[PDB]
Amino acid sequence: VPVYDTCTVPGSFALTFDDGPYGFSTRLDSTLNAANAKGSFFINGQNWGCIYDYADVLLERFNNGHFIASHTWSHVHMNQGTYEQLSHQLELVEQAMIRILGVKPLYMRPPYGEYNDVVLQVLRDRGYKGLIMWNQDSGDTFTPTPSSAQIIDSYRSFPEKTISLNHEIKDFTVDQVIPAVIPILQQKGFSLQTVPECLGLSSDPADWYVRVQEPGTRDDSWTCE
Ligand SMILES: [Zn+2]
Numbered sequence: 001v002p003v004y005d006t007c008t009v010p011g012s013f014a015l016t017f018d019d020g021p022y023g024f025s026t027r028l029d030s031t032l033n034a035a036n037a038k039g040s041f042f043i044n045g046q047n048w049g050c051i052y053d054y055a056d057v058l059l060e061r062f063n064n065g066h067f068i069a070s071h072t073w074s075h076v077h078m079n080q081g082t083y084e085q086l087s088h089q090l091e092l093v094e095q096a097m098i099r100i101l102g103v104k105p106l107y108m109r110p111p112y113g114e115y116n117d118v119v120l121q122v123l124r125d126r127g128y129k130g131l132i133m134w135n136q137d138s139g140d141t142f143t144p145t146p147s148s149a150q151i152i153d154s155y156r157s158f159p160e161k162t163i164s165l166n167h168e169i170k171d172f173t174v175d176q177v178i179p180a181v182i183p184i185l186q187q188k189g190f191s192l193q194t195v196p197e198c199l200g201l202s203s204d205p206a207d208w209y210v211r212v213q214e215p216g217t218r219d220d221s222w223t224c225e
Contacts, residue, residue: 001123003115005133007161007198013190014198015178016040016134018071018109019047020168021054021061028174029061035182037192039066041168042109042132043093045073048169050224051096059215062101065205067194069132070094070108079114086122094126099216103209107132107195127210132195134165140173148176155181160190161198 007014017028020043032039041061045051051058062068072078073092081089094104106129110119113133123131136158139146146154155177158164166173185192197203 001120001128001131003120003131003133004195004199005135005163007163007193007195008200009161009191009193009198011160011189011191012193012198013158013160013185014040014163014195015166015192016042016109016132016163016195017166017168017173018042019044019075021051021057022048022169024171024174025054025057025061025168028168028178029057029064029066031174031179031182032066032192033064035186035192037182037186038194038197039192040132040195041066041068042071043068044071044075045093045096046224047075051093052100052218052222052224055100055218055222058097058100062103062205065194067107067196067205067208068097068101068105069195069208070105072108072111075111077112077114078110078119079116081118083118083122086119087126090122090126097209098212099222101209102213102215103211106130106209109133132163134163136162136164138164138166138173138177140170140177141167148172148180151177152180152184156184158185163195163198
């Protein structure tokens with residue numbers, strides 16, 4: 001399983017978001033969609049909300065050509081887990097995407113950027129095609145936290161082919177940073193692409209997932225409890 005941290009397509013730029021969806025996601029996606037920009041989303045199952053409660057956002061996101069990938073179920077320190085626990089951690093997210101969207105993800109990003117040989121082996125055994133890291137950090141979860149103005153200014157110097165880490169769970173990222181930096185990056189000639197496209201893999205969204213079955217309808221199984 002390859003590890004990726006930088007784009008390869010010239011002029012490309014990957015805005016990525018961890019820990020979502022969240023109560024600001026419809027706003028974020030509206031902002032991206034209005035600019036024809038595509039985001040990359042590494043979602044949790046049960047961390048800042050139960051993924052099943054975000055089904056409507058996930059569906060809009062999925063059908064609008066944004067990249068959705070796994071961030072584990074419980075946002076675990078993956079280096080402290082056994083093969084079996086990590087497989088369960090991935091499986092539970094797969095199951096939620098199968099029920100809501102009809103598909104399994106083919107990519108993932110480890111929480112805290114922590115991974116080891118056992119993680120890569122589980123990814124390989126479970127059919128994943130890549131582990132996606134990053135090469136620039138917005139800082140939006142640093143503590144103390146940079147101001148929006150400071151984060152926006154850092155984005156003015158991120159070079160082409162950046163894979164940028166952001167977090168959907170920070171209100172100022174959705175409401176201040178991303179509305180300001182989309183024009184900065186697009187106006188200077190960068191193409192705001194998903195991670196798979198920016199890596200020269202496919203730009204067709206269907207290639208980022210495994211079709212499993214038709215999406216389900218909400219029933220009593222759509223729960224993190
Ligand atoms: Zn995270």
